[PDB]
Nucleic acid binder design. Structure first.
Lengths: 125, 173, 242, 95
RNA sequence: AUUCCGGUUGAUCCUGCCGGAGGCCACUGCUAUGGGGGUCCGACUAAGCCAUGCGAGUCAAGGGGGCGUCCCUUCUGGGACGCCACCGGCGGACGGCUCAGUAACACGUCGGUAACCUACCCUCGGGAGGGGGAUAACCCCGGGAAACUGGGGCUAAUCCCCCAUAGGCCUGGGGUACUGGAAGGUCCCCAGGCCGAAAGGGAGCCGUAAGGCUCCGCCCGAGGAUGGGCCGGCGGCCGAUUAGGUAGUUGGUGGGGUAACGGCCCACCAAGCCGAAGAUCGGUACGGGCCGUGAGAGCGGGAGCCCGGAGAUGGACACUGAGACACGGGUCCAGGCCCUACGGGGCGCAGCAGGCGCGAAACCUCCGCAAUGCGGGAAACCGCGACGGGGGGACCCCCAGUGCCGUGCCUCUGGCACGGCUUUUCCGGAGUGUAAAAAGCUCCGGGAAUAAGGGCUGGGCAAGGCCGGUGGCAGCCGCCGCGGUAAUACCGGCGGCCCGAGUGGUGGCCACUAUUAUUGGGCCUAAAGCGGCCGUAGCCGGGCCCGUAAGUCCCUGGCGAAAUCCCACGGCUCAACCGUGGG
């Protein structure tokens, strides 16, 4: 799986030989490429210690706030720009740094849809 | 690392064949009727440990050093090797004969419960000698001064009867 | 090779604060999690069997315990792995015996007899203070116990203070603050089991703990950790600590 | 053989009294459990059916044999608390 | 004991190595009467391969059934307690074994997590409202050689699912009530959303009923405790006949994922990062507490006991669970075996015994859960090749025996003759000891009766110029050296000496060795000054005055587990061994 353990190279440049097998606690998971869709799609993941994570794979709505605490549940049209990757904007992928378009205007995302289960954003004045 | 291994309590001479040491040890063994040289070497090692402790404490300063000095002097006095008024200097003047004199067989012979050291060893091994109200069968036991006067025949041994022929023979000496 | 929590404890690795023969047997009772730390605690089985001698074997010790004949603080304890720590009251109502668990001068735990009136008091050092739901203040004591008060009494309690609490009803008797001249008793460190009065408090940058100076009945001055200093009175000890 | 009681303790969490004693018996073999129990009950005015002898230990080169025994208030408590093997050894349980 | 002795010459003094002499571990020849205590015994070559038995179970007070007994109204149906498997809960991720791999934040120590998870347990503040659903057991029918397994009926739960609320998580706008050395933390008010609980279940006593009490229980929040994850500074091996290495590599800007920070991963920006103070590469190796040795400095080892790390035939993967990518659970590949009715189906003792192989080199296919601990249970209690007990073994230490006395003889450190004495040990017996035994311990009967070998004998080095055999042959010899017809040096006889239940042989480590030299070695002629100079880093550096306290010294808090080591006392007879205090 996606091992997230120690690197195989010393900072000097030499190589490191593992002294033990991979442990179950050092494993990751596949990225949750949250896409714009017509309906919200989410799943529940059991994590270390029996905790729960809500993973959003397709997002249709967004909670948008405007400089005063007022919040509105609106619809996501498209991703204008996503600096996290040069193709996420083209493919309509939502991440914590994305800039999306809604009927009210441009909104910058402030949550992590892969870890939160919801999409929250702040309007751009 | 390694675990603990029980080390020997006696030391072997650096050279197995030296004329002077051989003659001296032969004299000591013949006089004190010891079974083997390792007994004599054990007593020599006891002496040497005492002297090493005294030497280390002489050039030592500290509260623990004073406590150890007092404890060493008290232990020696209790063993009966030093006079009650002795000081740390008198420790280095001890000799092997002093320790050999405190063996249970030697003290039995001195008190006269046996005619000879061999007979004293026989009595100790066979259990005819009692320490306090207790029987001990170790001829190498170092008697303590606080009790040295309570050594006598065990109350159940035949040697406790003045009539016993062996006791009469021992007495008429 | 290790995959999860340990369930055993060898006698040769037992905490140094216990009074146990470390070579008579191979296995020791692993303390169950409880009020106090493992370093300042001892399973109740050893108190029932070794310390007091009421039992000769763990089986009959458990048989005694299951009948609720041993009381810790004010609650009957039946689990033989229950930890009992510093400033804890062990009461045996059938015998009338009441003991206070305290460290001696070498850091080992011992049982000091106390009186029946004293048996209903257990001092608790306020280890931490926080807020909970509804705007209430929660105090966490040195033994892991917790108490709740209203925001009105916010300033009546502070960290390092002592609270005298009747048990098992858990009523607040009084609060002993931590200031100059407050009688204190050291529960840990090189100066364990030494009592005195506070003199000065010194703070340092970073997370280095604060250090408190104490004056003993002979007038000598020594130092210890502010967390190690346990308040037991204002000018004289309100409880017996000989 | 002469029995001398060195310690008496009254345990009431377990309804019993613990007796540590010694037997002075120079020139004689170690006394039997039956005889030791009989003399102990005669001296202490105990109940024969609610008393056990934990051990009679003879030391080396000594005329004094140490002994540990217990006396229970109730036979029911005796049976409940004491192990089966010691009761069998003392003969209380037929087995 | 802070040590020396033999050997280079016709004779002497040096340098220098070899040997002798001591201790420890492994194998081994000969020999061997006991008893205690201990952390000893297939580590060295094969982490090579395994027949058979055992090494993880528990709960009837969560639930429904079956068989048996009893009390029964009596076709009805009700109540109990015995046994049984099934669902269900917890555990099986600890304990046990081995040292392969690993030169690494693996280990030791001091600190961080304000960047994080935690079933069991403790405390405080709350809640347990309404519904639904199968299916095991059981009954009918089976197949398959087995391993295994299909269809139908029927049902219960602390089994499972749903609704509500309480509650969790993100984000935005506000107040500053809290712990902190310092708040991306906690608390209070609004706003948008996602996720989203429980067993008022069981037992007992009462109570006409209702209802009450006690015990063990369920769910959420905030803390603790236990057990962990991750991270930082310092410290501990050899090679230059290994000189350049690195390319997700160094750092950043933004994200994903993680229980959590992190090039852990991704996209985009730059060329950074390590290295003669030895990078990279190669060899060897589990790290430490500790053990051996030495007067010490030091040198060597680091299997057995404790803590930590790894592995389960060699690899790679995943499910359930708080905890695993799991020794006696699962999937695949590679290797080696086993049953088969040939269709198919299983296994890997680096668990306790036992077997094969390997070798110079390592034990019983035994008894109990009675003591200490672990899991389960309300408890009694059940299970545990962990542990406790015994069996075999010249494993390590401690205490002993193989007789003692008197007289008289002798070739007198001892043998013999006569008369006596004791029973540690030997044989038999009664008690006590043990879970049951055995061993030990008290006592009784017999009786000196049952008990000494190994090396050496010219010097170094204690001990023979004695006698028979061989005549440079056999042989002996760590070194010197001896044997050629006159051998105290070879073989044997008789004497003698050193240790003695031990004594010799072989390999290894330390001392010897001031032959590794900081303490503390040498370089004209014995080994050793570059053929000679200038200079880079490094090391070593003139005098006086003032300032800082980095180094240095003193004092004072927190540490450096236990065992091991030394001392005193007390308990096993003293001792070995254990316990209590000090270091």
């Amino acid at each position: 799986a996606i091992w997230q353990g120690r690197s195989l190279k010393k900072p000097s440049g030499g190589r490191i030989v593992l002294a033990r097998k991979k442990r179950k606690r050092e494993l990751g998971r596949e990225p949750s490429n949250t896409r714009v869709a017509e309906q919200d799609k989410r799943k529940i993941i059991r994590t270390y210690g029996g905790n729960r994570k809500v993973r959003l794979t397709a997002a249709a709505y967004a909670n948008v706030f405007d400089k005063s605490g007022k919040g509105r549940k609106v619809r996501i049209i498209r991703v204008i720009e996503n600096p996290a990757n040069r193709q996420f904007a083209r493919r309509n992928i939502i991440t914590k740094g994305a800039i999306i378009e809604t009927e009210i205007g441009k909104a910058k995302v402030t949550s992590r849809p892969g870890q939160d289960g919801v999409v929250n954003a702040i309007l751009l004045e | 690392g390694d675990p603990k291994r029980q080390r020997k309590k006696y030391e072997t001479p650096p050279h197995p064949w030296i004329k002077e040491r051989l003659d001296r040890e032969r004299v000591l063994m013949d006089k004190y009727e010891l079974k083997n040289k390792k007994e004599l070497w054990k007593h020599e090692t006891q002496l040497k440990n005492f002297r090493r402790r005294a030497r280390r404490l002489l050039a030592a300063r500290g509260k623990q050093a004073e406590i150890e000095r007092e404890q060493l002097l008290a232990r020696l006095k209790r063993l009966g090797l030093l006079p009650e008024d002795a000081v740390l200097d008198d420790v280095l003047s001890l000799t092997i004969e002093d320790i050999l004199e405190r063996r249970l067989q030697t003290i039995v012979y001195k008190k006269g419960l046996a005619r000879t050291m061999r007979q004293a060893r026989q009595l100790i091994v066979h259990g005819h000698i009692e320490v306090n109200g207790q029987i001990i069968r170790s001829p190498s036991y170092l008697v303590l001064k606080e009790e040295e006067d309570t050594i006598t025949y065990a109350r159940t041994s035949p040697f406790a009867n003045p009539q016993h022929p062996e006791r009469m023979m021992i007495e008429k000496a | 090779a290790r995959k999860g929590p340990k369930r055993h404890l060898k006698r040769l690795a037992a905490p140094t604060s216990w009074y146990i023969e470390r070579k008579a047997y191979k296995w020791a009772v692993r303390p169950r999690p409880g009020p106090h730390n493992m370093r300042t605690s001892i399973p109740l089985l050893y108190i029932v069997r070794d310390y007091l001698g009421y039992a000769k074997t763990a089986r009959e010790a458990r048989k005694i315990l299951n009948e609720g004949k041993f009381l810790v603080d004010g609650r009957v304890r039946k689990d033989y792995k229950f930890p009992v720590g510093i400033m804890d009251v062990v009461s045996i109502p059938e015998t009338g015996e009441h003991y206070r668990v305290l460290p001696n001068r070498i850091g080992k735990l011992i049982l000091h007899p106390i009186s029946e009136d004293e048996a209903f008091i257990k001092p608790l050092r306020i280890r931490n203070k926080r807020m909970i739901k509804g705007a209430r203040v929660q105090l966490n004591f040195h033994d892991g116990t917790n108490h709740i008060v209203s925001i009105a009494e916010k300033d009546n309690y502070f960290t390092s203070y002592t609270v005298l609490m009747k048990v098992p009803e858990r009523e607040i008797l009084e609060v002993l603050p931590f200031e100059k001249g407050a009688y204190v008793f050291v529960t840990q460190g090189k100066n364990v089991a030494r009592k005195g009065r506070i003199v000065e408090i010194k703070r340092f940058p970073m997370g280095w703990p604060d250090v408190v100076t104490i004056e003993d009945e002979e007038g000598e001055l020594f130092d210890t950790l502010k967390e190690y200093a346990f308040v037991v009175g204002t000018d004289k000890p309100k409880i017996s600590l000989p | 053989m002469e029995i001398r009681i060195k310690e008496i303790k009254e345990n009431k969490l377990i309804g019993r009294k613990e007796i540590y004693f010694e037997i002075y018996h120079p020139g004689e073999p170690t006394p039997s459990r039956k005889d030791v129990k009989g003399k102990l009950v005669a001296m202490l005015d105990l109940n024969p059916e609610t008393t056990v002898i934990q051990y009679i230990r003879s030391y080396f080169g000594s005329y004094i044999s140490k002994g540990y025994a217990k006396a229970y208030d109730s036979k029911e408590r005796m049976l409940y608390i004491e192990p089966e093997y010691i009761l069998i050894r003392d003969g209380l349980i037929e087995k």
